[PDB]
């Protein structure tokens, strides 16, 4: 969704508008859902060692809400439990 906006801000909009639009895309699609995604997906991926998906989560959860630490908490709980 962000990439599609990235194209639309070039295709027809004045690209100077891109900053607040893409900031809003990530805030609304990733930021607001930081813990929703981590809680639903990370525990599973860690147990199955689904590296390709774990890599994406680590890399993507690094901006709007920090992402790190939240990743650490679910990760730590897995380790101690098992």
PDB file of N, CA, C and O in Angstrom, residues 1-80:
ATOM      1  N   UNK A   1       0.802  -1.208   0.000  1.00  0.00           N
ATOM      2  CA  UNK A   1       0.000   0.000   0.000  1.00  0.00           C
ATOM      3  C   UNK A   1       0.844   1.271   0.000  1.00  0.00           C
ATOM      4  O   UNK A   1       0.502   2.243  -0.673  1.00  0.00           O
ATOM      5  N   UNK A   2       1.962   1.251   0.727  1.00  0.00           N
ATOM      6  CA  UNK A   2       2.838   2.414   0.757  1.00  0.00           C
ATOM      7  C   UNK A   2       3.529   2.593  -0.592  1.00  0.00           C
ATOM      8  O   UNK A   2       3.695   3.712  -1.065  1.00  0.00           O
ATOM      9  N   UNK A   3       3.975   1.479  -1.185  1.00  0.00           N
ATOM     10  CA  UNK A   3       4.641   1.540  -2.477  1.00  0.00           C
ATOM     11  C   UNK A   3       3.696   2.061  -3.552  1.00  0.00           C
ATOM     12  O   UNK A   3       4.057   2.947  -4.322  1.00  0.00           O
ATOM     13  N   UNK A   4       2.437   1.610  -3.504  1.00  0.00           N
ATOM     14  CA  UNK A   4       1.441   2.098  -4.447  1.00  0.00           C
ATOM     15  C   UNK A   4       1.244   3.599  -4.293  1.00  0.00           C
ATOM     16  O   UNK A   4       1.204   4.320  -5.290  1.00  0.00           O
ATOM     17  N   UNK A   5       1.241   4.093  -3.052  1.00  0.00           N
ATOM     18  CA  UNK A   5       1.151   5.536  -2.850  1.00  0.00           C
ATOM     19  C   UNK A   5       2.405   6.201  -3.402  1.00  0.00           C
ATOM     20  O   UNK A   5       2.324   7.198  -4.114  1.00  0.00           O
ATOM     21  N   UNK A   6       3.548   5.549  -3.199  1.00  0.00           N
ATOM     22  CA  UNK A   6       4.824   6.041  -3.702  1.00  0.00           C
ATOM     23  C   UNK A   6       4.786   6.245  -5.215  1.00  0.00           C
ATOM     24  O   UNK A   6       5.416   7.165  -5.739  1.00  0.00           O
ATOM     25  N   UNK A   7       4.031   5.408  -5.918  1.00  0.00           N
ATOM     26  CA  UNK A   7       3.893   5.564  -7.358  1.00  0.00           C
ATOM     27  C   UNK A   7       2.899   6.672  -7.705  1.00  0.00           C
ATOM     28  O   UNK A   7       3.138   7.469  -8.613  1.00  0.00           O
ATOM     29  N   UNK A   8       1.811   6.763  -6.941  1.00  0.00           N
ATOM     30  CA  UNK A   8       0.761   7.748  -7.215  1.00  0.00           C
ATOM     31  C   UNK A   8       1.235   9.177  -6.966  1.00  0.00           C
ATOM     32  O   UNK A   8       0.891  10.098  -7.717  1.00  0.00           O
ATOM     33  N   UNK A   9       2.127   9.339  -5.989  1.00  0.00           N
ATOM     34  CA  UNK A   9       2.692  10.649  -5.681  1.00  0.00           C
ATOM     35  C   UNK A   9       3.647  11.132  -6.767  1.00  0.00           C
ATOM     36  O   UNK A   9       4.110  12.269  -6.727  1.00  0.00           O
ATOM     37  N   UNK A  10       4.025  10.232  -7.665  1.00  0.00           N
ATOM     38  CA  UNK A  10       4.849  10.584  -8.804  1.00  0.00           C
ATOM     39  C   UNK A  10       3.973  10.713 -10.047  1.00  0.00           C
ATOM     40  O   UNK A  10       4.173  11.601 -10.875  1.00  0.00           O
ATOM     41  N   UNK A  11       3.035   9.781 -10.186  1.00  0.00           N
ATOM     42  CA  UNK A  11       2.205   9.661 -11.371  1.00  0.00           C
ATOM     43  C   UNK A  11       1.324  10.886 -11.605  1.00  0.00           C
ATOM     44  O   UNK A  11       1.192  11.345 -12.737  1.00  0.00           O
ATOM     45  N   UNK A  12       0.693  11.407 -10.550  1.00  0.00           N
ATOM     46  CA  UNK A  12      -0.204  12.536 -10.742  1.00  0.00           C
ATOM     47  C   UNK A  12      -0.205  13.593  -9.631  1.00  0.00           C
ATOM     48  O   UNK A  12      -0.440  14.773  -9.913  1.00  0.00           O
ATOM     49  N   UNK A  13       0.105  13.214  -8.395  1.00  0.00           N
ATOM     50  CA  UNK A  13       0.088  14.197  -7.308  1.00  0.00           C
ATOM     51  C   UNK A  13       1.385  14.984  -7.288  1.00  0.00           C
ATOM     52  O   UNK A  13       2.385  14.564  -7.866  1.00  0.00           O
ATOM     53  N   UNK A  14       1.358  16.150  -6.660  1.00  0.00           N
ATOM     54  CA  UNK A  14       2.591  16.863  -6.393  1.00  0.00           C
ATOM     55  C   UNK A  14       3.361  16.086  -5.336  1.00  0.00           C
ATOM     56  O   UNK A  14       2.850  15.851  -4.241  1.00  0.00           O
ATOM     57  N   UNK A  15       4.559  15.632  -5.688  1.00  0.00           N
ATOM     58  CA  UNK A  15       5.310  14.687  -4.870  1.00  0.00           C
ATOM     59  C   UNK A  15       5.698  15.250  -3.512  1.00  0.00           C
ATOM     60  O   UNK A  15       6.017  14.500  -2.590  1.00  0.00           O
ATOM     61  N   UNK A  16       5.618  16.566  -3.354  1.00  0.00           N
ATOM     62  CA  UNK A  16       5.942  17.181  -2.072  1.00  0.00           C
ATOM     63  C   UNK A  16       4.908  16.794  -1.014  1.00  0.00           C
ATOM     64  O   UNK A  16       5.168  16.881   0.187  1.00  0.00           O
ATOM     65  N   UNK A  17       3.759  16.296  -1.471  1.00  0.00           N
ATOM     66  CA  UNK A  17       2.678  15.848  -0.601  1.00  0.00           C
ATOM     67  C   UNK A  17       2.965  14.449  -0.058  1.00  0.00           C
ATOM     68  O   UNK A  17       2.284  13.964   0.847  1.00  0.00           O
ATOM     69  N   UNK A  18       3.939  13.774  -0.667  1.00  0.00           N
ATOM     70  CA  UNK A  18       4.256  12.395  -0.335  1.00  0.00           C
ATOM     71  C   UNK A  18       4.616  12.215   1.124  1.00  0.00           C
ATOM     72  O   UNK A  18       4.242  11.217   1.736  1.00  0.00           O
ATOM     73  N   UNK A  19       5.344  13.168   1.690  1.00  0.00           N
ATOM     74  CA  UNK A  19       5.850  13.005   3.043  1.00  0.00           C
ATOM     75  C   UNK A  19       4.749  12.690   4.064  1.00  0.00           C
ATOM     76  O   UNK A  19       4.836  11.661   4.736  1.00  0.00           O
ATOM     77  N   UNK A  20       3.705  13.526   4.207  1.00  0.00           N
ATOM     78  CA  UNK A  20       2.597  13.290   5.108  1.00  0.00           C
ATOM     79  C   UNK A  20       1.717  12.120   4.689  1.00  0.00           C
ATOM     80  O   UNK A  20       1.180  11.426   5.551  1.00  0.00           O
ATOM     81  N   UNK A  21       1.681  11.791   3.398  1.00  0.00           N
ATOM     82  CA  UNK A  21       0.838  10.671   3.001  1.00  0.00           C
ATOM     83  C   UNK A  21       1.471   9.340   3.356  1.00  0.00           C
ATOM     84  O   UNK A  21       0.810   8.469   3.914  1.00  0.00           O
ATOM     85  N   UNK A  22       2.765   9.199   3.088  1.00  0.00           N
ATOM     86  CA  UNK A  22       3.424   7.929   3.345  1.00  0.00           C
ATOM     87  C   UNK A  22       3.650   7.760   4.834  1.00  0.00           C
ATOM     88  O   UNK A  22       3.626   6.639   5.348  1.00  0.00           O
ATOM     89  N   UNK A  23       3.852   8.873   5.540  1.00  0.00           N
ATOM     90  CA  UNK A  23       3.949   8.817   6.983  1.00  0.00           C
ATOM     91  C   UNK A  23       2.645   8.293   7.561  1.00  0.00           C
ATOM     92  O   UNK A  23       2.652   7.411   8.420  1.00  0.00           O
ATOM     93  N   UNK A  24       1.522   8.754   7.007  1.00  0.00           N
ATOM     94  CA  UNK A  24       0.217   8.292   7.453  1.00  0.00           C
ATOM     95  C   UNK A  24      -0.036   6.841   7.063  1.00  0.00           C
ATOM     96  O   UNK A  24      -0.662   6.099   7.817  1.00  0.00           O
ATOM     97  N   UNK A  25       0.480   6.416   5.910  1.00  0.00           N
ATOM     98  CA  UNK A  25       0.295   5.025   5.517  1.00  0.00           C
ATOM     99  C   UNK A  25       0.995   4.100   6.498  1.00  0.00           C
ATOM    100  O   UNK A  25       0.415   3.114   6.945  1.00  0.00           O
ATOM    101  N   UNK A  26       2.245   4.400   6.831  1.00  0.00           N
ATOM    102  CA  UNK A  26       2.957   3.517   7.738  1.00  0.00           C
ATOM    103  C   UNK A  26       2.379   3.595   9.143  1.00  0.00           C
ATOM    104  O   UNK A  26       2.195   2.571   9.800  1.00  0.00           O
ATOM    105  N   UNK A  27       2.023   4.796   9.584  1.00  0.00           N
ATOM    106  CA  UNK A  27       1.441   4.942  10.908  1.00  0.00           C
ATOM    107  C   UNK A  27       0.137   4.163  11.027  1.00  0.00           C
ATOM    108  O   UNK A  27      -0.077   3.463  12.019  1.00  0.00           O
ATOM    109  N   UNK A  28      -0.695   4.216   9.989  1.00  0.00           N
ATOM    110  CA  UNK A  28      -1.989   3.549  10.023  1.00  0.00           C
ATOM    111  C   UNK A  28      -1.918   2.050   9.748  1.00  0.00           C
ATOM    112  O   UNK A  28      -2.752   1.290  10.237  1.00  0.00           O
ATOM    113  N   UNK A  29      -0.960   1.616   8.928  1.00  0.00           N
ATOM    114  CA  UNK A  29      -0.923   0.205   8.558  1.00  0.00           C
ATOM    115  C   UNK A  29       0.069  -0.605   9.403  1.00  0.00           C
ATOM    116  O   UNK A  29      -0.117  -1.804   9.601  1.00  0.00           O
ATOM    117  N   UNK A  30       1.131   0.035   9.884  1.00  0.00           N
ATOM    118  CA  UNK A  30       2.151  -0.661  10.667  1.00  0.00           C
ATOM    119  C   UNK A  30       2.146  -0.211  12.123  1.00  0.00           C
ATOM    120  O   UNK A  30       2.114  -1.035  13.037  1.00  0.00           O
ATOM    121  N   UNK A  31       2.143   1.102  12.336  1.00  0.00           N
ATOM    122  CA  UNK A  31       2.247   1.673  13.676  1.00  0.00           C
ATOM    123  C   UNK A  31       1.096   1.234  14.574  1.00  0.00           C
ATOM    124  O   UNK A  31       1.305   0.613  15.619  1.00  0.00           O
ATOM    125  N   UNK A  32      -0.123   1.463  14.102  1.00  0.00           N
ATOM    126  CA  UNK A  32      -1.330   1.126  14.854  1.00  0.00           C
ATOM    127  C   UNK A  32      -1.455  -0.374  15.077  1.00  0.00           C
ATOM    128  O   UNK A  32      -2.175  -0.822  15.973  1.00  0.00           O
ATOM    129  N   UNK A  33      -0.801  -1.156  14.228  1.00  0.00           N
ATOM    130  CA  UNK A  33      -0.907  -2.603  14.278  1.00  0.00           C
ATOM    131  C   UNK A  33       0.384  -3.277  14.733  1.00  0.00           C
ATOM    132  O   UNK A  33       0.528  -4.492  14.603  1.00  0.00           O
ATOM    133  N   UNK A  34       1.296  -2.515  15.340  1.00  0.00           N
ATOM    134  CA  UNK A  34       2.568  -3.095  15.781  1.00  0.00           C
ATOM    135  C   UNK A  34       2.371  -4.337  16.624  1.00  0.00           C
ATOM    136  O   UNK A  34       2.899  -5.406  16.302  1.00  0.00           O
ATOM    137  N   UNK A  35       1.606  -4.211  17.699  1.00  0.00           N
ATOM    138  CA  UNK A  35       1.472  -5.304  18.640  1.00  0.00           C
ATOM    139  C   UNK A  35       0.461  -6.332  18.159  1.00  0.00           C
ATOM    140  O   UNK A  35       0.551  -7.508  18.508  1.00  0.00           O
ATOM    141  N   UNK A  36      -0.462  -5.908  17.301  1.00  0.00           N
ATOM    142  CA  UNK A  36      -1.431  -6.840  16.740  1.00  0.00           C
ATOM    143  C   UNK A  36      -0.724  -7.871  15.869  1.00  0.00           C
ATOM    144  O   UNK A  36      -0.980  -9.072  15.978  1.00  0.00           O
ATOM    145  N   UNK A  37       0.246  -7.406  15.089  1.00  0.00           N
ATOM    146  CA  UNK A  37       0.986  -8.274  14.186  1.00  0.00           C
ATOM    147  C   UNK A  37       1.976  -9.136  14.956  1.00  0.00           C
ATOM    148  O   UNK A  37       2.107 -10.331  14.682  1.00  0.00           O
ATOM    149  N   UNK A  38       2.699  -8.529  15.895  1.00  0.00           N
ATOM    150  CA  UNK A  38       3.690  -9.266  16.663  1.00  0.00           C
ATOM    151  C   UNK A  38       3.044 -10.375  17.482  1.00  0.00           C
ATOM    152  O   UNK A  38       3.482 -11.523  17.440  1.00  0.00           O
ATOM    153  N   UNK A  39       1.922 -10.059  18.129  1.00  0.00           N
ATOM    154  CA  UNK A  39       1.246 -11.033  18.976  1.00  0.00           C
ATOM    155  C   UNK A  39       0.666 -12.189  18.175  1.00  0.00           C
ATOM    156  O   UNK A  39       0.644 -13.327  18.648  1.00  0.00           O
ATOM    157  N   UNK A  40       0.160 -11.899  16.983  1.00  0.00           N
ATOM    158  CA  UNK A  40      -0.453 -12.927  16.156  1.00  0.00           C
ATOM    159  C   UNK A  40       0.561 -13.753  15.371  1.00  0.00           C
ATOM    160  O   UNK A  40       0.349 -14.947  15.150  1.00  0.00           O
ATOM    161  N   UNK A  41       1.649 -13.125  14.927  1.00  0.00           N
ATOM    162  CA  UNK A  41       2.559 -13.807  14.017  1.00  0.00           C
ATOM    163  C   UNK A  41       3.908 -14.228  14.602  1.00  0.00           C
ATOM    164  O   UNK A  41       4.430 -15.279  14.233  1.00  0.00           O
ATOM    165  N   UNK A  42       4.469 -13.454  15.527  1.00  0.00           N
ATOM    166  CA  UNK A  42       5.859 -13.691  15.897  1.00  0.00           C
ATOM    167  C   UNK A  42       6.067 -14.996  16.657  1.00  0.00           C
ATOM    168  O   UNK A  42       7.009 -15.734  16.370  1.00  0.00           O
ATOM    169  N   UNK A  43       5.171 -15.321  17.587  1.00  0.00           N
ATOM    170  CA  UNK A  43       5.372 -16.519  18.405  1.00  0.00           C
ATOM    171  C   UNK A  43       5.407 -17.770  17.536  1.00  0.00           C
ATOM    172  O   UNK A  43       6.214 -18.681  17.761  1.00  0.00           O
ATOM    173  N   UNK A  44       4.547 -17.799  16.525  1.00  0.00           N
ATOM    174  CA  UNK A  44       4.498 -18.898  15.574  1.00  0.00           C
ATOM    175  C   UNK A  44       5.780 -18.987  14.764  1.00  0.00           C
ATOM    176  O   UNK A  44       6.379 -20.056  14.640  1.00  0.00           O
ATOM    177  N   UNK A  45       6.189 -17.853  14.208  1.00  0.00           N
ATOM    178  CA  UNK A  45       7.343 -17.814  13.333  1.00  0.00           C
ATOM    179  C   UNK A  45       8.609 -18.200  14.082  1.00  0.00           C
ATOM    180  O   UNK A  45       9.477 -18.880  13.532  1.00  0.00           O
ATOM    181  N   UNK A  46       8.712 -17.785  15.343  1.00  0.00           N
ATOM    182  CA  UNK A  46       9.881 -18.124  16.139  1.00  0.00           C
ATOM    183  C   UNK A  46       9.944 -19.623  16.396  1.00  0.00           C
ATOM    184  O   UNK A  46      10.996 -20.240  16.231  1.00  0.00           O
ATOM    185  N   UNK A  47       8.795 -20.231  16.681  1.00  0.00           N
ATOM    186  CA  UNK A  47       8.759 -21.654  16.989  1.00  0.00           C
ATOM    187  C   UNK A  47       9.109 -22.508  15.772  1.00  0.00           C
ATOM    188  O   UNK A  47       9.852 -23.488  15.881  1.00  0.00           O
ATOM    189  N   UNK A  48       8.678 -22.062  14.596  1.00  0.00           N
ATOM    190  CA  UNK A  48       8.946 -22.782  13.356  1.00  0.00           C
ATOM    191  C   UNK A  48      10.262 -22.349  12.716  1.00  0.00           C
ATOM    192  O   UNK A  48      10.617 -22.820  11.635  1.00  0.00           O
ATOM    193  N   UNK A  49      10.934 -21.383  13.337  1.00  0.00           N
ATOM    194  CA  UNK A  49      12.149 -20.796  12.788  1.00  0.00           C
ATOM    195  C   UNK A  49      11.928 -20.341  11.352  1.00  0.00           C
ATOM    196  O   UNK A  49      12.769 -20.561  10.476  1.00  0.00           O
ATOM    197  N   UNK A  50      10.812 -19.659  11.115  1.00  0.00           N
ATOM    198  CA  UNK A  50      10.509 -19.160   9.784  1.00  0.00           C
ATOM    199  C   UNK A  50      11.283 -17.885   9.511  1.00  0.00           C
ATOM    200  O   UNK A  50      10.721 -16.788   9.446  1.00  0.00           O
ATOM    201  N   UNK A  51      12.568 -18.071   9.242  1.00  0.00           N
ATOM    202  CA  UNK A  51      13.533 -16.992   9.132  1.00  0.00           C
ATOM    203  C   UNK A  51      13.156 -15.871   8.154  1.00  0.00           C
ATOM    204  O   UNK A  51      13.331 -14.706   8.503  1.00  0.00           O
ATOM    205  N   UNK A  52      12.714 -16.164   6.918  1.00  0.00           N
ATOM    206  CA  UNK A  52      12.327 -15.176   5.923  1.00  0.00           C
ATOM    207  C   UNK A  52      11.277 -14.194   6.447  1.00  0.00           C
ATOM    208  O   UNK A  52      11.327 -13.000   6.145  1.00  0.00           O
ATOM    209  N   UNK A  53      10.377 -14.682   7.301  1.00  0.00           N
ATOM    210  CA  UNK A  53       9.293 -13.854   7.806  1.00  0.00           C
ATOM    211  C   UNK A  53       9.728 -13.127   9.061  1.00  0.00           C
ATOM    212  O   UNK A  53       9.327 -11.986   9.304  1.00  0.00           O
ATOM    213  N   UNK A  54      10.584 -13.777   9.838  1.00  0.00           N
ATOM    214  CA  UNK A  54      11.134 -13.162  11.030  1.00  0.00           C
ATOM    215  C   UNK A  54      12.027 -12.003  10.623  1.00  0.00           C
ATOM    216  O   UNK A  54      12.042 -10.957  11.273  1.00  0.00           O
ATOM    217  N   UNK A  55      12.752 -12.187   9.518  1.00  0.00           N
ATOM    218  CA  UNK A  55      13.631 -11.154   8.998  1.00  0.00           C
ATOM    219  C   UNK A  55      12.832  -9.939   8.574  1.00  0.00           C
ATOM    220  O   UNK A  55      13.189  -8.811   8.913  1.00  0.00           O
ATOM    221  N   UNK A  56      11.695 -10.170   7.918  1.00  0.00           N
ATOM    222  CA  UNK A  56      10.859  -9.054   7.508  1.00  0.00           C
ATOM    223  C   UNK A  56      10.348  -8.298   8.719  1.00  0.00           C
ATOM    224  O   UNK A  56      10.375  -7.071   8.741  1.00  0.00           O
ATOM    225  N   UNK A  57       9.891  -9.024   9.736  1.00  0.00           N
ATOM    226  CA  UNK A  57       9.346  -8.374  10.917  1.00  0.00           C
ATOM    227  C   UNK A  57      10.395  -7.554  11.646  1.00  0.00           C
ATOM    228  O   UNK A  57      10.142  -6.407  12.011  1.00  0.00           O
ATOM    229  N   UNK A  58      11.597  -8.095  11.783  1.00  0.00           N
ATOM    230  CA  UNK A  58      12.667  -7.339  12.414  1.00  0.00           C
ATOM    231  C   UNK A  58      12.955  -6.056  11.647  1.00  0.00           C
ATOM    232  O   UNK A  58      13.102  -4.985  12.238  1.00  0.00           O
ATOM    233  N   UNK A  59      13.079  -6.177  10.328  1.00  0.00           N
ATOM    234  CA  UNK A  59      13.437  -5.055   9.471  1.00  0.00           C
ATOM    235  C   UNK A  59      12.348  -3.983   9.391  1.00  0.00           C
ATOM    236  O   UNK A  59      12.651  -2.789   9.370  1.00  0.00           O
ATOM    237  N   UNK A  60      11.087  -4.410   9.310  1.00  0.00           N
ATOM    238  CA  UNK A  60       9.977  -3.473   9.151  1.00  0.00           C
ATOM    239  C   UNK A  60       9.622  -2.786  10.457  1.00  0.00           C
ATOM    240  O   UNK A  60       9.352  -1.581  10.482  1.00  0.00           O
ATOM    241  N   UNK A  61       9.695  -3.519  11.559  1.00  0.00           N
ATOM    242  CA  UNK A  61       9.384  -2.939  12.849  1.00  0.00           C
ATOM    243  C   UNK A  61      10.624  -2.249  13.395  1.00  0.00           C
ATOM    244  O   UNK A  61      11.282  -2.751  14.307  1.00  0.00           O
ATOM    245  N   UNK A  62      10.979  -1.134  12.763  1.00  0.00           N
ATOM    246  CA  UNK A  62      12.184  -0.394  13.103  1.00  0.00           C
ATOM    247  C   UNK A  62      12.017   1.120  12.929  1.00  0.00           C
ATOM    248  O   UNK A  62      13.003   1.859  12.941  1.00  0.00           O
ATOM    249  N   UNK A  63      10.782   1.581  12.717  1.00  0.00           N
ATOM    250  CA  UNK A  63      10.556   2.993  12.415  1.00  0.00           C
ATOM    251  C   UNK A  63       9.548   3.685  13.330  1.00  0.00           C
ATOM    252  O   UNK A  63       9.898   4.162  14.409  1.00  0.00           O
ATOM    253  N   UNK A  64       8.286   3.721  12.896  1.00  0.00           N
ATOM    254  CA  UNK A  64       7.265   4.587  13.492  1.00  0.00           C
ATOM    255  C   UNK A  64       7.064   4.370  14.988  1.00  0.00           C
ATOM    256  O   UNK A  64       6.845   5.328  15.731  1.00  0.00           O
ATOM    257  N   UNK A  65       7.051   3.119  15.415  1.00  0.00           N
ATOM    258  CA  UNK A  65       6.851   2.801  16.821  1.00  0.00           C
ATOM    259  C   UNK A  65       8.101   2.220  17.461  1.00  0.00           C
ATOM    260  O   UNK A  65       8.017   1.531  18.480  1.00  0.00           O
ATOM    261  N   UNK A  66       9.242   2.381  16.801  1.00  0.00           N
ATOM    262  CA  UNK A  66      10.484   1.798  17.294  1.00  0.00           C
ATOM    263  C   UNK A  66      10.578   0.335  16.891  1.00  0.00           C
ATOM    264  O   UNK A  66      11.583  -0.105  16.335  1.00  0.00           O
ATOM    265  N   UNK A  67       9.561  -0.442  17.267  1.00  0.00           N
ATOM    266  CA  UNK A  67       9.434  -1.838  16.855  1.00  0.00           C
ATOM    267  C   UNK A  67      10.270  -2.773  17.713  1.00  0.00           C
ATOM    268  O   UNK A  67       9.786  -3.795  18.208  1.00  0.00           O
ATOM    269  N   UNK A  68      11.536  -2.419  17.875  1.00  0.00           N
ATOM    270  CA  UNK A  68      12.438  -3.172  18.725  1.00  0.00           C
ATOM    271  C   UNK A  68      11.950  -3.048  20.154  1.00  0.00           C
ATOM    272  O   UNK A  68      11.101  -2.208  20.444  1.00  0.00           O
ATOM    273  N   UNK A  69      12.353  -3.988  21.000  1.00  0.00           N
ATOM    274  CA  UNK A  69      11.864  -4.079  22.377  1.00  0.00           C
ATOM    275  C   UNK A  69      10.510  -4.791  22.407  1.00  0.00           C
ATOM    276  O   UNK A  69      10.338  -5.777  23.122  1.00  0.00           O
ATOM    277  N   UNK A  70       9.556  -4.318  21.609  1.00  0.00           N
ATOM    278  CA  UNK A  70       8.302  -5.054  21.445  1.00  0.00           C
ATOM    279  C   UNK A  70       8.586  -6.441  20.862  1.00  0.00           C
ATOM    280  O   UNK A  70       8.123  -7.452  21.396  1.00  0.00           O
ATOM    281  N   UNK A  71       9.499  -6.486  19.887  1.00  0.00           N
ATOM    282  CA  UNK A  71       9.978  -7.744  19.321  1.00  0.00           C
ATOM    283  C   UNK A  71      10.696  -8.570  20.381  1.00  0.00           C
ATOM    284  O   UNK A  71      10.560  -9.795  20.437  1.00  0.00           O
ATOM    285  N   UNK A  72      11.458  -7.879  21.224  1.00  0.00           N
ATOM    286  CA  UNK A  72      12.275  -8.505  22.256  1.00  0.00           C
ATOM    287  C   UNK A  72      11.410  -9.158  23.321  1.00  0.00           C
ATOM    288  O   UNK A  72      11.768 -10.204  23.862  1.00  0.00           O
ATOM    289  N   UNK A  73      10.295  -8.514  23.657  1.00  0.00           N
ATOM    290  CA  UNK A  73       9.426  -9.010  24.714  1.00  0.00           C
ATOM    291  C   UNK A  73       8.753 -10.319  24.338  1.00  0.00           C
ATOM    292  O   UNK A  73       8.793 -11.276  25.110  1.00  0.00           O
ATOM    293  N   UNK A  74       8.243 -10.417  23.114  1.00  0.00           N
ATOM    294  CA  UNK A  74       7.595 -11.659  22.708  1.00  0.00           C
ATOM    295  C   UNK A  74       8.634 -12.753  22.529  1.00  0.00           C
ATOM    296  O   UNK A  74       8.422 -13.903  22.918  1.00  0.00           O
ATOM    297  N   UNK A  75       9.785 -12.364  22.001  1.00  0.00           N
ATOM    298  CA  UNK A  75      10.900 -13.269  21.803  1.00  0.00           C
ATOM    299  C   UNK A  75      11.390 -13.841  23.132  1.00  0.00           C
ATOM    300  O   UNK A  75      11.571 -15.056  23.263  1.00  0.00           O
ATOM    301  N   UNK A  76      11.552 -12.976  24.132  1.00  0.00           N
ATOM    302  CA  UNK A  76      12.005 -13.397  25.450  1.00  0.00           C
ATOM    303  C   UNK A  76      11.019 -14.357  26.102  1.00  0.00           C
ATOM    304  O   UNK A  76      11.417 -15.368  26.682  1.00  0.00           O
ATOM    305  N   UNK A  77       9.723 -14.057  25.979  1.00  0.00           N
ATOM    306  CA  UNK A  77       8.699 -14.907  26.574  1.00  0.00           C
ATOM    307  C   UNK A  77       8.764 -16.310  25.993  1.00  0.00           C
ATOM    308  O   UNK A  77       8.682 -17.297  26.732  1.00  0.00           O
ATOM    309  N   UNK A  78       8.982 -16.400  24.681  1.00  0.00           N
ATOM    310  CA  UNK A  78       9.142 -17.691  24.024  1.00  0.00           C
ATOM    311  C   UNK A  78      10.288 -18.469  24.652  1.00  0.00           C
ATOM    312  O   UNK A  78      10.133 -19.625  25.042  1.00  0.00           O
ATOM    313  N   UNK A  79      11.433 -17.816  24.796  1.00  0.00           N
ATOM    314  CA  UNK A  79      12.620 -18.510  25.269  1.00  0.00           C
ATOM    315  C   UNK A  79      12.447 -19.034  26.673  1.00  0.00           C
ATOM    316  O   UNK A  79      12.792 -20.181  26.961  1.00  0.00           O
ATOM    317  N   UNK A  80      11.956 -18.185  27.565  1.00  0.00           N
ATOM    318  CA  UNK A  80      11.799 -18.576  28.953  1.00  0.00           C
ATOM    319  C   UNK A  80      10.763 -19.677  29.101  1.00  0.00           C
ATOM    320  O   UNK A  80      10.969 -20.628  29.853  1.00  0.00           O
TER     321      UNK A  80
END
